[PDB]
Ligand binder design. Structure first.
Ligand SMILES: C[C@H]1O[C@H](O[C@H]2[C@H](O)[C@@H](O)[C@@H](O)O[C@@H]2CO)[C@H](O)[C@@H](O)[C@@H]1N[C@H]1C=C(CO)[C@@H](O[C@H]2O[C@H](CO)[C@@H](O[C@H]3O[C@H](C)[C@@H](N[C@H]4C=C(CO)[C@@H](O)[C@H](O)[C@H]4O)[C@H](O)[C@H]3O)[C@H](O)[C@H]2O)[C@H](O)[C@H]1O
Ligand SMILES: OC[C@H]1O[C@H](O[C@H]2[C@H](O)[C@@H](O)[C@@H](O)O[C@@H]2CO)[C@H](O)[C@@H](O)[C@@H]1O
Ligand SMILES: OC[C@H]1O[C@@H](O)[C@H](O)[C@@H](O)[C@@H]1O
Ligand SMILES: OC[C@H]1O[C@H](O)[C@H](O)[C@@H](O)[C@@H]1O
Ligand SMILES: OC[C@H]1O[C@H](O)[C@H](O)[C@@H](O)[C@@H]1O
Ligand SMILES: [Ca+2]
Ligand SMILES: [Ca+2]
Ligand SMILES: [Ca+2]
Ligand code: NA
Length: 481
């Protein structure tokens, strides 16, 4: 009955030095000590170059094992290093979740000359040219792997489209391969959002349907995975992704394989439509809660803190909510830049770590810092919040989201976790106090601030109430001294 806590074990700007798998393995016992129970590791297969973060997917059967793209290792290291790291996580009781990129492929071995039409980038259902022959990056043969594990080769007729004609080099185009149709259902932004980048996989094609299930089975088996992080699920045929997840569970013996999808949309309704169309079979990153954390941070005291959880997965669908403050895309300089400022970050982490709703995900970029962007490591204060979650965030919750600035909640504690119970209080503005119910069983106990932000103590009265303060623009988490 211990709380679960995920860590995203990478950030965008890590050096291309083939050390991440070695570090992850060495970190396992430390991650266990701070309460991390699952690790999301980056795309572990060969990208279009050695330095690829992993999203520019070339060969999903090359886990840093084959001489392809001028390298054996990936950015992160070798197959054997990743396997050793997962053995070390499992030796420490930590789940391993592999990033799974199924939308597209990049770094084709060869061009193919194929018939295509242009479509409106704002309305991909609208054809805007006659048919003509383009030079497309659609031929994937993987000669460096030489058919090891899989003889499957990719050609144009397994893709729906590309955004580049190597023969004409025109910018701002999207090409639909002749005879192909955008997959459905996908997100309807730009009319049909199947196409994102690269060579867009055709999930209408039955050879592709079979092959990508076969790959999924091989990947989970090969690395003995507990779960998957599914990339760009709003751009992949909804009913196929649902079928893919059922198939891998059934074939790998991983009947309860954990799945969290990235459906990047700021409106809850989009995430609810996805869950509806995939039978509520997977969790989703709580993108709306991340936007709420950004709006509060960016409001400089004037945000209404009563609204912090509104229109979120965490409030509305907590079983399926993977809550986060920042990720590799929201960090400075990246594609979804929407960074939660240092001052607010502890309030955001206290929200996801001490509440009963959601599966929180700690960002590597927050814990260990982002030196290339002058982002300080936050591990010193994160370790105290993670202690709050590991040891104290148990039992019945009472919410006091009843002030524009000062909000809080309590956990009563449960018998399985000795000394458990807490009161979280926080302000986006001036400091304040909240009288909150931690439980009559705490009557006469003295509470301290496990964050160390406050050095005063709080005595629980006989009615099970304390008056819990915080500093301005700060959080305190009150536990039994
Ligand atoms: C980053 C997220 O993008 C999408 O988000 C959209 C929203 O959906 C939309 O509503 C609105 O908010 O705009 C957003 C930004 O566009 C997407 O929905 C979401 O799933 C994405 N996060 C995921 C997905 C991916 C992709 O798998 C990850 O993306 C990251 O890695 C990308 C690939 O390296 C990188 O893309 C940039 O670089 C590539 C190289 C380039 N592609 C061209 C280049 C080549 C070969 O070099 C050829 O293949 C073609 O000519 C081109 O397609 C892109 O043009 C460029 O954008 C991306 O920056 C990076 O974020 C992401 O990490 C996941 O978490
Ligand atoms: O932390 C390991 C834990 O992860 C998953 O449990 C999730 C669950 O699926 C979600 O619905 C939500 O409540 O968060 C849980 C994590 O606390 C795995 O399914 C589970 O087996 C595993 O122990
Ligand atoms: O150092 C320059 C900037 O770095 C960003 O990542 C921060 O959020 C800013 O508040 C800061 O001013
Ligand atoms: O929003 C556009 C979508 O409308 C419909 O559902 C069509 O079946 C689909 O092919 C199309 O892309
Ligand atoms: O959303 C606008 C900007 O808001 C904040 O300043 C964020 O730190 C930055 O990442 C984002 O780009
Ligand atoms: Ca697609
Ligand atoms: Ca199609
Ligand atoms: Ca406020
Ligand atoms: Na497609």
């Amino acid at each position: 009955g211990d709380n679960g806590t995920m860590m995203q074990y990478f950030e965008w700007y890590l050096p291309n030095d083939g050390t991440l798998w070695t570090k992850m393995g060495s970190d396992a016992s430390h991650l266990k000590s701070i309460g991390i129970t699952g690790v999301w590791f980056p795309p572990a297969y060969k990208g279009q170059s050695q330095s690829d973060v992993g999203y520019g997917v070339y060969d999903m059967y090359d886990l840093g094992e084959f001489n392809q793209k001028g390298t054996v290792r990936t950015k992160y290291g070798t197959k054997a290093q990743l396997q050793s790291a997962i053995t070390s996580l499992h030796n420490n009781g930590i789940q391993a979740y592999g990033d799974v990129v199924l939308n597209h492929r990049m770094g084709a071995d060869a061009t193919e000359t194929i018939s295509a039409v242009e479509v409106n980038p704002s309305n991909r259902n609208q054809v805007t040219s006659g048919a003509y022959n383009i030079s497309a990056w659609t031929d994937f043969e993987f000669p460096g792997r030489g058919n090891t594990y899989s003889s499957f080769k990719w050609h144009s007729y397994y893709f729906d489209g590309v955004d580049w004609d190597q023969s004409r080099q025109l910018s701002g185009k999207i090409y639909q391969i002749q005879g192909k149709a955008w997959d459905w259902e996908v997100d309807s932004e730009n009319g049909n959002y199947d196409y994102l980048m690269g060579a867009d996989i055709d999930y209408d094609h039955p050879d592709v349907q079979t092959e990508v299930k076969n790959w999924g089975k091989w990947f989970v088996n090969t690395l003995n995975l507990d779960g998957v992080r599914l990339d760009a699920v709003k751009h992949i045929k909804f009913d196929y992704m649902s079928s893919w997840l059922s198939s891998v569970k059934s074939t790998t013996g991983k009947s309860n394989l954990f799945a969290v999808g990235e459906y990047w949309n700021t409106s809850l309704g989009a995430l609810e439509n996805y869950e509806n169309k995939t039978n509520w079979s997977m969790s989703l990153f709580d993108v709306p809660l991340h936007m709420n954390f950004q709006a509060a941070a960016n409001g400089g005291g004037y945000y209404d803190m009563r609204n912090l959880l509104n229109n979120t997965m965490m409030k509305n669908h907590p079983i399926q909510a993977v809550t986060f403050v920042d990720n590799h895309d929201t960090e400075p300089g990246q594609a979804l830049q929407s960074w939660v400022s240092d001052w607010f970050k502890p309030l955001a982490y206290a929200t996801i770590l001490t509440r009963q709703e959601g599966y929180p995900c700690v960002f590597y970029g927050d814990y260990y810092g982002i030196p290339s962007q002058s982002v300080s490591a936050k591990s010193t204060w994160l370790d105290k919040q993670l202690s709050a979650r590991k040891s104290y965030a148990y039992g019945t919750q009472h919410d006091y989201l009843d002030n524009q600035d000062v909000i809080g909640w309590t956990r009563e504690g449960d018998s399985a976790h000795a000394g458990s119970g807490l009161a979280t209080v926080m302000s986006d503005g001036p400091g304040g106090s909240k009288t909150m119910y931690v439980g009559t069983a705490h009557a006469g106990q003295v509470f301290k601030d496990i964050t160390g932000n406050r050095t005063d103590t709080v005595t629980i009265n006989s009615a099970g109430n304390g008056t819990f303060p915080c500093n301005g623009g700060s959080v305190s988490i009150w536990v039994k001294q």
